[PDB]
Amino acid sequence: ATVFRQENVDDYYDTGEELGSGQFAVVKKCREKSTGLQYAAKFIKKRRTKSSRRGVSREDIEREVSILKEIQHPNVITLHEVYENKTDVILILELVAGGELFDFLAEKESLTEEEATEFLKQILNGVYYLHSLQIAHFDLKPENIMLLDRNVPKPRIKIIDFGLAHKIDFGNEFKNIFGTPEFVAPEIVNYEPLGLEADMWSIGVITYILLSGASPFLGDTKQETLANVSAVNYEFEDEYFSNTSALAKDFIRRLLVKDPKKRMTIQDSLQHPWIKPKDTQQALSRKAAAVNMEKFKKFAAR
Ligand SMILES: [Cl-]
Ligand SMILES: [Cl-]
Ligand SMILES: [Cl-]
Ligand SMILES: [Cl-]
Ligand SMILES: [Cl-]
Ligand SMILES: [Mg+2]
């Protein structure tokens, strides 16, 4: 294992209100005393004993930290420092204060597909960076797509929450069942080999929702959702996709593909004509098409 900083974090930071909390983690805003700069402190509860289920394993904490330490990119969250005490490992992280992307978009009166792709492209750039380092995020979904500051002319997207991320090992297949059913790829559902492709599936799902306000595979039970995912049971129902471009639907179709090897890669998604129009005709079609804002607002409010 790694020996993280052993000092009391309170000696170096002033901490305040909770910004969020998961099953084994609490996040608090904090201010570094030496610099006066604000960060987010994520307190992760250690398992401490192997037989206990009330915390995170050291293997899992070290994996997340090791991945965070490697990554430096404008569209992914930055790790500042790591502390630990008898009960917690404490990640001092870049503060992302602009809330979830979808909540910010939902406040708009309208959104063209052109404007939508400007935000989506930032997600793609962050994932392009990760995949270039052979890092799979494995938990891409709207609540992990944040804004650094929502009150600037061109808000910057930050991908957060690397708690499921893995460096892909060439010499050994990784198989695991994890994540949120609505957003995971068929190979996750079916305990099949996992790689960078699973993230691309998730991007397809995020894009589908962004444009329509509907979730492609969400069923009435967890089991039904997983069945929909495995069967790639989705539709572009006219109630939701009436003013969606052919290009946008093709983009999504090339991502929501059962066979990971046939799924569009991140490099190819960046060259797809919906993202990178090849002529004026394609450009105008994208600018003309619009997000179903009425339906989308209801999604963000769910
Ligand atoms: Cl800063
Ligand atoms: Cl560090
Ligand atoms: Cl799952
Ligand atoms: Cl299933
Ligand atoms: Cl279809
Ligand atoms: Mg975590």
Swiss-Prot record:
Which residues does the annotation say bind ATP? Answer: 19-27, 42, 94-96, 100, 161
Q: Where is the signal peptide?
A: none
- Residues modified as Phosphoserine are A289
Up-regulation conditions: Up-regulated following treatment with IFNG/IFN-gamma.
Kindly list any coiled-coil regions of this protein. none
The active site is formed by: D139 (proton acceptor)
| Protein kinase domain residues | 13-275
Q: How is it modified after translation?
A: Ubiquitinated by the BCR(KLHL20) E3 ubiquitin ligase complex, leading to its degradation by the proteasome.
Free-text tissue specificity from the UniProt record: Isoform 2 is expressed in normal intestinal tissue as well as in colorectal carcinomas.
Annotated region (Autoinhibitory domain), positions in chain: 292-301
Assembly information from the UniProt record: Interacts with KLHL20. Interacts (via death domain) with MAPK1 and MAPK3. Interacts with MAP1B (via N-terminus). Interacts with PRKD1 in an oxidative stress-regulated manner. Interacts with PIN1, PDCD6, BECN1, TSC2 and STX1A. Interacts (via kinase domain) with DAPK3 (via kinase domain). Interacts with GRINB. Interacts (via death domain) with UNC5B (via death domain). Interacts with UNC5C (via death domain).
Q: What is known of its domains?
A: The autoinhibitory domain sterically blocks the substrate peptide-binding site by making both hydrophobic and electrostatic contacts with the kinase core.
Give the record's family classification.
Answer: Belongs to the protein kinase superfamily. CAMK Ser/Thr protein kinase family. DAP kinase subfamily.
Tell me, what does this protein do in biology?
Calcium/calmodulin-dependent serine/threonine kinase involved in multiple cellular signaling pathways that trigger cell survival, apoptosis, and autophagy. Regulates both type I apoptotic and type II autophagic cell deaths signal, depending on the cellular setting. The former is caspase-dependent, while the latter is caspase-independent and is characterized by the accumulation of autophagic vesicles. Phosphorylates PIN1 resulting in inhibition of its catalytic activity, nuclear localization, and cellular function. Phosphorylates TPM1, enhancing stress fiber formation in endothelial cells.
Q: What is this protein called?
A: Death-associated protein kinase 1
Q: Which part of the entire sequence is included in the shown chain?
A: 2 to 302 of 1430
